[PDB]
Design an enzyme around this catalytic site. Structure first.
Site, PDB file in Angstrom:
ATOM      1  N   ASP A 135      -6.443  11.644  -1.493  1.00 14.61           N
ATOM      2  CA  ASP A 135      -6.533   9.802  -1.702  1.00 14.61           C
ATOM      3  C   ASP A 135      -7.670   9.275  -3.660  1.00 14.61           C
ATOM      4  O   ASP A 135      -7.759  10.412  -3.901  1.00 14.61           O
ATOM      5  CB  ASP A 135      -7.055   8.749  -0.391  1.00 14.61           C
ATOM      6  CG  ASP A 135      -8.403   8.620  -0.240  1.00 14.61           C
ATOM      7  OD1 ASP A 135      -9.378   9.506  -1.199  1.00 14.61           O
ATOM      8  OD2 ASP A 135      -9.175   8.516   0.613  1.00 14.61           O
ATOM      9  N   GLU A 145       0.641  -1.166  -0.008  1.00 15.84           N
ATOM     10  CA  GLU A 145      -0.142   0.212   0.252  1.00 15.84           C
ATOM     11  C   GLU A 145       0.296   1.815   0.105  1.00 15.84           C
ATOM     12  O   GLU A 145       0.146   2.419  -0.060  1.00 15.84           O
ATOM     13  CB  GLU A 145      -0.808  -0.100   0.780  1.00 15.84           C
ATOM     14  CG  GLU A 145      -2.415  -0.868   1.210  1.00 15.84           C
ATOM     15  CD  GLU A 145      -3.056  -0.629   2.164  1.00 15.84           C
ATOM     16  OE1 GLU A 145      -3.062   0.861   3.119  1.00 15.84           O
ATOM     17  OE2 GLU A 145      -3.842  -1.621   2.265  1.00 15.84           O
TER      18      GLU A 145
END
Ligand SMILES: CCNC(=O)[C@H]1O[C@@H](n2cnc3c(NCC(c4ccccc4)c4ccccc4)nc(C(=O)NCCNC(=O)NC4CCN(c5ccccn5)CC4)nc32)[C@H](O)[C@@H]1O
Ligand SMILES: CCCCCCCC/C=C\CCCCCCCC(=O)OC[C@H](O)CO
Length: 444
Positions: A216, A207
């Site tokens: 994001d 990640e």
């Protein structure tokens, strides 16, 4: 055989190799599109510095050793250029080193930090710095404000370039510091390469880790590994929640140490979630630490509803039927949608070890060995010469290294200033392949 004659001969043999080898490196980068990334922009730049070392610097360095009667400043000028051009190698080698450090240790900021613009700028900085330093003698710090007659000297490096310049400014600032930085880079890459693995490193590989606040996929402010801070559109609200979670004023930046404290809180949260879920709870209890990490990984990706969707595969994990489980998980939409991440997680399930993630590091064990080679050479080739100078300048009374040794030291200094790209470039498969493709073609 005359000593001097053997020196000129070896030095020109080096000159040619430098030219031939480094042209080769720039040729490779010219053909193969896949070699035309930003690192190789630094490589070519060094390639080029080294070509001029072979074509100019070395011939001037030879001249500087013959001791004919020249105008002092004419001989100062020749001397200065050899300093400029050798300087350019060192710094250009250092940019390569710093490029690698960022690419291996902070890979989520590399693109938006070393772009093509900035690279070309940094190359300008290297060359300008080389001139600044190498031309210093000409601005006055030199050995002829006050045999050959008036105004002329015997053209020998030490007759026109002061020894205090070479030790205090040049050695300490333009060899020792670059070397020391390269050493720290090597060591820090090494520690990354051979790092201990666990659930934190596991998810960093899958990640990413961010030490600074970013928006994001869907616009929400986040930090560390996957940690949502707030849905609110305000950076200021984001940083406030960050402070409450951490325990100090961050200004939106954290340490790796601190992002582990966050990650672990999120892990505890996933475990609590899993324990409440009646489809996952038994599977989790039956597993060992490493396979637990695999299960928790899936959850961070899909949430718990989704992981509970894999009824059949969860069943087989509980019955400890590893190979049968792996095949089952590999048929999913998850595998097809994100295959790299899934294969790593499925291997973890198959084996109970960190192997899939270990393999991800072999490319940086590679990088570290390369840096080791470069730094070791560099020390080997530049130190004898500058160490020889320091002894001469501090302890002029004491015993001398013999002529052949002192002159070998120069030869060594010029060997590194030419064969450096080549070794770095030779150890890369994509280069090595392109070399073969030219050699068995344009040569033949
Ligand atoms: C990014 C940094 N860049 C560089 O460092 C580059 O700059 C050049 N360089 C850097 N220090 C250099 C350097 N030190 C001078 C040093 C020396 C001499 C010869 C070989 C290596 C080092 C010296 C030491 C002691 C006394 C004087 C100079 N002498 C030369 C360069 O031509 N010497 C060759 C031409 N002289 C000479 O035969 N003298 C002779 C040598 C023997 N005698 C001695 C010996 C002991 C005591 C007294 N008398 C009489 C003078 N070149 C240098 C070299 O090309 C590097 O690659
Ligand atoms: C192998 C490299 C040999 C170095 C050649 C050498 O040192 O030459 C003798 C000296 O130059 C005489 O003044």
């Amino acid at each position: 055989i005359m000593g001097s004659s053997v020196y000129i001969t070896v030095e020109l043999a080096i000159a040619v190799l430098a030219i031939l080898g480094n042209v080769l490196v720039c040729w490779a980068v010219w053909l193969n599109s896949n070699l035309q990334n930003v690192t190789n922009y630094f490589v070519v730049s060094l390639a080029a510095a080294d070509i001029a070392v072979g074509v100019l610097a070395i011939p001037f360095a030879i001249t500087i050793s013959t001791g004919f009667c020249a105008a002092c400043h004419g001989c100062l000028f020749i001397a200065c250029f050899v300093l400029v051009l050798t300087q350019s190698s060192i710094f250009s080698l250092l940019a390569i080193a710093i490029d690698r450090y960022i690419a291996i240790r902070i890979p989520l900021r590399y693109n938006g930090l070393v772009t093509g613009t900035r690279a070309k700028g940094i190359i300008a900085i290297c060359w300008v710095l080389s001139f600044a330093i190498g031309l210093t003698p000409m601005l006055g710090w030199n050995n002829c404000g006050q045999g050959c007659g008036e105004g002329q000297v015997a053209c020998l490096f030490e007759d026109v370039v002061p020894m205090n310049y070479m030790v205090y400014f040049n050695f300490f600032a333009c060899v020792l510091v670059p070397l020391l930085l390269m050493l720290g880079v090597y060591l820090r890459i090494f520690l990354a390469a051979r790092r201990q693995l666990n659930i934190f490193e596991m998810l960093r590989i899958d990640e990413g880790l961010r030490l600074k606040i970013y928006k994001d996929t869907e616009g929400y402010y986040t930090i560390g590994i996957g940690h949502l801070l707030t849905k609110s559109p305000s950076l200021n609200a984001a940083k406030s929640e960050l402070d409450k979670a951490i325990g100090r004023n961050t200004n939106g930046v954290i340490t790796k140490d601190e992002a582990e404290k966050l990650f672990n809180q999120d892990v505890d949260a996933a475990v609590r979630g899993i324990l409440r879920n009646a489809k996952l709870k038994p599977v989790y209890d039956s597993l060992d630490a490493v396979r637990r990490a695999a299960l928790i990984n899936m959850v961070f990706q899909m949430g718990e509803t989704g992981v509970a969707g894999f009824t059949n595969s969860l069943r087989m994990l509980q019955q400890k039927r590893w190979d049968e489980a792996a095949v089952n998980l590999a048929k999913s939409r998850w595998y097809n949608q994100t295959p790299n991440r899934a294969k790593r997680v499925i291997t973890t399930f198959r084996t109970g070890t960190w192997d899939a993630y270990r393999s991800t590091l072999q490319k940086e064990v590679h990088a570290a060995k390369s840096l080791a080679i470069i730094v070791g050479l560099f020390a080997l080739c530049w130190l004898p010469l500058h160490i020889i100078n320091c002894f001469t300048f501090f302890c002029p009374d004491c015993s001398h290294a013999p002529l052949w040794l002192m002159y070998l030291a120069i030869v060594l200094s010029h060997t590194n200033s030419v064969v450096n790209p080549f070794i770095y470039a030779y150890r890369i498969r994509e280069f090595r392949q392109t070399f073969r493709k030219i050699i068995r073609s344009h040569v033949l």
